[PDB]
Amino acid sequence: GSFVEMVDNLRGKSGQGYYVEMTVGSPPQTLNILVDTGSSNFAVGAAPHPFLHRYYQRQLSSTYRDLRKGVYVPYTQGKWEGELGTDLVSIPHGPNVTVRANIAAITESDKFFINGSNWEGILGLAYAEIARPDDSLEPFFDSLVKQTHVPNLFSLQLCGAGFPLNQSEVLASVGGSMIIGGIDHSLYTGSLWYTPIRREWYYEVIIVRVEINGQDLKMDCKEYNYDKSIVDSGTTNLRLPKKVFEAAVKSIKAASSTEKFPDGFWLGEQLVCWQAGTTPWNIFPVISLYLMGEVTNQSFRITILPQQYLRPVEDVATSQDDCYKFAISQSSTGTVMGAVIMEGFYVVFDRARKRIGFAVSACHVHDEFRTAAVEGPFVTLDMEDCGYNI
Numbered sequence: 592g593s594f595v596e597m598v599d600n601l602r603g604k605s606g607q608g609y610y611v612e613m614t615v616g617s618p619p620q621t622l623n624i625l626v627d628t629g630s631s632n633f634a635v636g637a638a639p640h641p642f643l644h645r646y647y648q649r650q651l652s653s654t655y656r657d658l659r660k661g662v663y664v665p666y667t668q669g670k671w672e673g674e675l676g677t678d679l680v681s682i683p684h685g686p687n688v689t690v691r692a693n694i695a696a697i698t699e700s701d702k703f704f705i706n707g708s709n710w711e712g713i714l715g716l717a718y719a720e721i722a723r724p725d726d727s728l729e730p731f732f733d734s735l736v737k738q739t740h741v742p743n744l745f746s747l748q749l750c751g752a753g754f755p756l757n758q759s760e761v762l763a764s765v766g767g768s769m770i771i772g773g774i775d776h777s778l779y780t781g782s783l784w785y786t787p788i789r790r791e792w793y794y795e796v797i798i799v800r801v802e803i804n805g806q807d808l809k810m811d812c813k814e815y816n817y818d819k820s821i822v823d824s825g826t827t828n829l830r831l832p833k834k835v836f837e838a839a840v841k842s843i844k845a846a847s848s849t850e851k852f853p854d855g856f857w858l859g860e861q862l863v864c865w866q867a868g869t870t871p872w873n874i875f876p877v878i879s880l881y882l883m884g885e886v887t888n889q890s891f892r893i894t895i896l897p898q899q900y901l902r903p904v905e906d907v908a909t910s911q912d913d914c915y916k917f918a919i920s921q922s923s924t925g926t927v928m929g930a931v932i933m934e935g936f937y938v939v940f941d942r943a944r945k946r947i948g949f950a951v952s953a954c955h956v957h958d959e960f961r962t963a964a965v966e967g968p969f970v971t972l973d974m975e976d977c978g979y980n981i
């Protein structure tokens with residue numbers, strides 16, 4: 592592991608997000624920032640909010656520059672509005688550099704800030720094409736690379752604990768690593784396998800085959816990428832296109848049929864609980880997603896366990912039972928490989944080579960009988976037809 596200064600620099604959990612410490616302004620103002628590979632704006636709370644105990648104070652920064660421009664960003668579950676400007680930004684447990692970056696000072700929001708998440712802003716790590724108001728607002732990572740010698744690459748190890756973390760525990764626990772400018776080999780086991788970034792906007796990829804316990808879901812592969820497939824640390828669940836979700840849940844129900852679960856469980860709304868330590872992991876199937884490889888007609892697969900797709904939640908009774916929510920849900924906007932999937936892998940966002948790498952995570956939760964996996968190669972034909980075109 593050659594990047595010790597950045598190892599273990601993340602905190603958080605799949606449901607409320609993983610964050611990294613950053614500083615903004617002169618003198619430096621410390622803020623916890625959500626790592627979001629599914630957006631492209633660096634936006635931080637800049638005004639009092641019930642869920643914030645600190646925020647960016649522009650008037651206290653001598654290096655603050657006002658862009659005299661507003662920004663409005665509505666999203667599925669909510670929205671954030673702010674004022675654009677630039678200032679000096681650093682990552683304490685990151686590369687030893689300071690860069691001038693765009694910052695959206697959030698002045699109004701709805702369903703953005705999460706009570707108790709311990710973060711005050713978000714770091715959009717995707718491409719300028721999806722930056723708001725438009726692609727002229729240079730994303731933080733683009734600025735970082737343009738202004739320093741930092742390699743155009745970052746890697747994420749998100750570490751799920753495998754059990755509920757109370758408020759005190761989640762603040763004291765290491766939630767993972769964000770390695771800026773490199774790959775730290777202590778964070779994964781086995782080999783790294785790369786899939787092409789199809790297009791530079793979201794981190795878009797192409798899924799070419801899906802298996803539930805080795806059983807082919809057997810759908811036209813274009814269904815798996817309708818209308819796109821992305822890797823998004825800012826989404827909790829593995830989200831699947833409606834038709835794929837329907838087929839996958841049918842297959843997961845069949846594999847786990849020795850136990851009947853309520854409709855609310857499958858809808859990802861209600862938790863299911865087992866006596867302490869008795870979670871029947873073995874009745875649940877592993878899920879394999881085959882991804883396009885970098886070699887013509889070659890693919891590889893990533894396999895996750897129910898320890899990834901069943902998300903640990905505290906029982907409404909704080910009892911001693913082990914409880915979970917089903918973290919696979921439907922989407923009308925394509926496949927989203929969210930945090931619960933990323934928790935099984937060390938994921939390399941190799942922007943320089945326009946590819947995303949996957950390897951088994953040194954911190955993935957498993958049992959004595961099964962482990963997550965990244966395996967290849969497999970001969971796979973016509974993978975280009977798996978990509979969706981509007």
Ligand SMILES: CN1C(=N)N[C@](CCC2CCCCC2)(CC2CCCCC2)C1=O
Binds near residue numbers: 627667668702826
């Ligand atoms: C899922 N998702 C995401 N990964 N980022 C956003 C915005 C997505 C962008 C995508 C491009 C267009 C503008 C919105 C924000 C949320 C992230 C978690 C914390 C609450 C807000 C979102 O809705």
